[PDB]
Amino acid sequence: PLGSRYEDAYQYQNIFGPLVKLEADYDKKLKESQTQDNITVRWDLGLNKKRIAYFTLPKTDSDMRLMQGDEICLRYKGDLAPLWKGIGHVIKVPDNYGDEIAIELRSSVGAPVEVTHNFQVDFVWKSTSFDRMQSALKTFAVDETSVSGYIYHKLLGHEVEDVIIKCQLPKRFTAQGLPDLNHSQVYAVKTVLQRPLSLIQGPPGTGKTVTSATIVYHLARQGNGPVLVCAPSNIAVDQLTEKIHQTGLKVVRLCAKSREAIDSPVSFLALHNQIRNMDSMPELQKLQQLKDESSADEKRYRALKRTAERELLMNADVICCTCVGAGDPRLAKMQFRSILIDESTQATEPECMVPVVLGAKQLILVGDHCQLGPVVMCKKAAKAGLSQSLFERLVVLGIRPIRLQVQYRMHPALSAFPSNIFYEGSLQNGVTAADRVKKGFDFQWPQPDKPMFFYVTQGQEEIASSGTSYLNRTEAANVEKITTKLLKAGAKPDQIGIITPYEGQRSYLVQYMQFSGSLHTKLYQEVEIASVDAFQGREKDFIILSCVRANEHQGIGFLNDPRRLNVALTRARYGVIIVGNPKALSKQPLWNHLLNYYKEQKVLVEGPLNNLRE
Ligand SMILES: Nc1ncnc2c1ncn2[C@@H]1O[C@H](COP(=O)(O)OP(=O)(O)NP(=O)(O)O)[C@@H](O)[C@H]1O
Numbered sequence: 001p002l003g004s005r006y007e008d009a010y011q012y013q014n015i016f017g018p019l020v021k022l023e024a025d026y027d028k029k030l031k032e033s034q035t036q037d038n039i040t041v042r043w044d045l046g047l048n049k050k051r052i053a054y055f056t057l058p059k060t061d062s063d064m065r066l067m068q069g070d071e072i073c074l075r076y077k078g079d080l081a082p083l084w085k086g087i088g089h090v091i092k093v094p095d096n097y098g099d100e101i102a103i104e105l106r107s108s109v110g111a112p113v114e115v116t117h118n119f120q121v122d123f124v125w126k127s128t129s130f131d132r133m134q135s136a137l138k139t140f141a142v143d144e145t146s147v148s149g150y151i152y153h154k155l156l157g158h159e160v161e162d163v164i165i166k167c168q169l170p171k172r173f174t175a176q177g178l179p180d181l182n183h184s185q186v187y188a189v190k191t192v193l194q195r196p197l198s199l200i201q202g203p204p205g206t207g208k209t210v211t212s213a214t215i216v217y218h219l220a221r222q223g224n225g226p227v228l229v230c231a232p233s234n235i236a237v238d239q240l241t242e243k244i245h246q247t248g249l250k251v252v253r254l255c256a257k258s259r260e261a262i263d264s265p266v267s268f269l270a271l272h273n274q275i276r277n278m279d280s281m282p283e284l285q286k287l288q289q290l291k292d293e294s295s296a297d298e299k300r301y302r303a304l305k306r307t308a309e310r311e312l313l314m315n316a317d318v319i320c321c322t323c324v325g326a327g328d329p330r331l332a333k334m335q336f337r338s339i340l341i342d343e344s345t346q347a348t349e350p351e352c353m354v355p356v357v358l359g360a361k362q363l364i365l366v367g368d369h370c371q372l373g374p375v376v377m378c379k380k381a382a383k384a385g386l387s388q389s390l391f392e393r394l395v396v397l398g399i400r401p402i403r404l405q406v407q408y409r410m411h412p413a414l415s416a417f418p419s420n421i422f423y424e425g426s427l428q429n430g431v432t433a434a435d436r437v438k439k440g441f442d443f444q445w446p447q448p449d450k451p452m453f454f455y456v457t458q459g460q461e462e463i464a465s466s467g468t469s470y471l472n473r474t475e476a477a478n479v480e481k482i483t484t485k486l487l488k489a490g491a492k493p494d495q496i497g498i499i500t501p502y503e504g505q506r507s508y509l510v511q512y513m514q515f516s517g518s519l520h521t522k523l524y525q526e527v528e529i530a531s532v533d534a535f536q537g538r539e540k541d542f543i544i545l546s547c548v549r550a551n552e553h554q555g556i557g558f559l560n561d562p563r564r565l566n567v568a569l570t571r572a573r574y575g576v577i578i579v580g581n582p583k584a585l586s587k588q589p590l591w592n593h594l595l596n597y598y599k600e601q602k603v604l605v606e607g608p609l610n611n612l613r614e
């Protein structure tokens with residue numbers, strides 16, 4: 001793809017720097033060309049004494065997904081002129097609680113509360129993440145202690161005499177609150193602790209994230225400073241934060257300042273939440289109550305929060321953050337001896353380099369290049385080398401990943417197809433059918449010993465009322481019938497996921513399951529519905545795919561990307577149900593194999609209380 005060898009870090013910066021600038025300009029253009037205007041706001045001083053405007057935008061399934069934290073710029077327009085400008089940040093996006101975007105605006109005064117149409121939602125571009133990428137390339141080139149010198153040479157592809165990191169290993173490598181390790185995982189931990197640089201590779205469910213949590217536990221039990229743990233996406237970092245919390249380490253989850261409205265299983269571990277509960281600093285406590293219920297108290301509250309952050313950050317055992325989030329100014333002046341990056345194959349190399357240059361002497365990279373890769377909008381940058389992850393470049397350089405092969409997530413039948421198509425049948429099972437026979441679940445499949453079937457459903461795929469996305473109302477109905485059948489059978493709502501490629505299908509499934517659901521509306525609200533991105537590195541007991549397209553033209557998500565389908569088929573533990581049109585999905589070498597294998601196992605069925613289909 002691109003020459004993996006480099007003379008020095010100056011030359012490295014000169015290659016990657018322009019690539020990053022190419023990506024920064026491209027999606028600056030794209031963001032500023034995504035303006036809506038015919039929208040109607042919904043003003044109200046939200047119960048936390050801060051103005052929170054609501055609005056609905058046309059359903060568009062893009063790759064630049066509007067996330068919680070993005071800066072948005074309102075604009076009152078039309079004939080009736082308190083015409084002004086107002087800036088805020090996204091406190092909520094389309095989800096299970098209705099498909100309405102909320103923002104929490106900074107200032108609350110000049111904004112007219114005349115809830116009146118003809119506004120203009122502009123997506124404010126931030127160079128933040130690209131600035132951090134460029135800054136990290138500069139630190140690699142200029143800062144002598146950015147990396148250990150061994151790692152400096154190994155990252156540039158130089159020939160280096162091997163170094164053995166000396167340390168007192170533990171007697172036993174399994175960590176307390178995590179699963180008992182394999183021989184392969186025990187080997188991975190033992191080997192990793194004594195190498196300055198290591199890659200860990202492995203198919204879905206093979207304990208990469210658990211093994212990473214275990215490694216971070218032992219690195220923390222050394223006398224060093226805080227271990228830095230990263231992943232490219234917020235979802236993957238939450239997965240890792242949770243496993244590390246289970247070992248009993250003092251964890252701090254750093255996130256961007258605007259993403260404090262997020263709620264995950266370990267949201268309480270976040271820095272902004274830990275600071276609210278500072279029992280050692282009652283005075284920022286007094287000021288925090290003040291902002292809820294001035295100008296001088298603002299600069300004092302600001303510096304008081306800066307002090308509390310420094311205290312928890314410098315005194316933590318582990319700091320979990322996004323790769324890009326490692327370049328956060330609050331982590332400036334800090335250095336990290338040990339650094340691990342889960343899901344490293346999902347990041348571009350400059351993004352992945354943001355944490356690395358903060359003093360790395362021991363570096364662990366965990367990945368799977370058959371799962372989600374980097375997202376590069378600009379095709380020119382991608383072709384010029386930005387699409388290759390750090391992990392993958394080191395593999396070309398000859399470092400051999402420690403490999404995990406035994407999965408413990410899925411049922412043998414579920415892992416059968418993904419292994420043969422994506423991993424050459426080299427993904428095997430450390431769990432059997434007896435282990436994945438859901439306890440307290442009276443449901444019988446169209447073929448026992450095989451918790452899976454492709455439900456056939458031809459239907460009118462149409463466009464979304466507002467937007468460019470697609471949906472399939474006939475399938476949606478069938479997906480609620482499957483969801484209702486699983487819930488009555490014993491399955492808990494929070495252990496069912498529904499993956500679908502399109503935004504129009506997601507939005508429709510949320511409203512339709514709640515309104516027209518047989519059971520309580522609160523139960524369908526508890527069932528997650530999203531694209532594969534939402535389930536990155538995660539697992540549910542049951543998954544339901546909803547392939548929307550019943551037409552001729554290309555798809556987008558798991559319809560035409562091998563990476564995304566693999567991830568879609570490897571989230572389930574106890575069973576998976578795919579819903580879609582066999583004919584429409586057939587025009588795709590990957591999906592035509594799926595339909596063949598399912599027909600051979602006598603699970604290509606149709607019509608409630610079902611039987612085989614041709
Ligand atoms: N040695 C083990 N023994 C028993 N169960 C295990 C073991 N390792 C992992 N598991 C199970 O697998 C789950 C953790 O899988 P995980 O560490 O997230 O795999 P992963 O490689 O990160 N999957 P992915 O992120 O999709 O590539 C846990 O719920 C465990 O029950």
Ligand SMILES: [Mg+2]
Nearest residue numbers: 208209239537
């Ligand atoms: Mg994972």
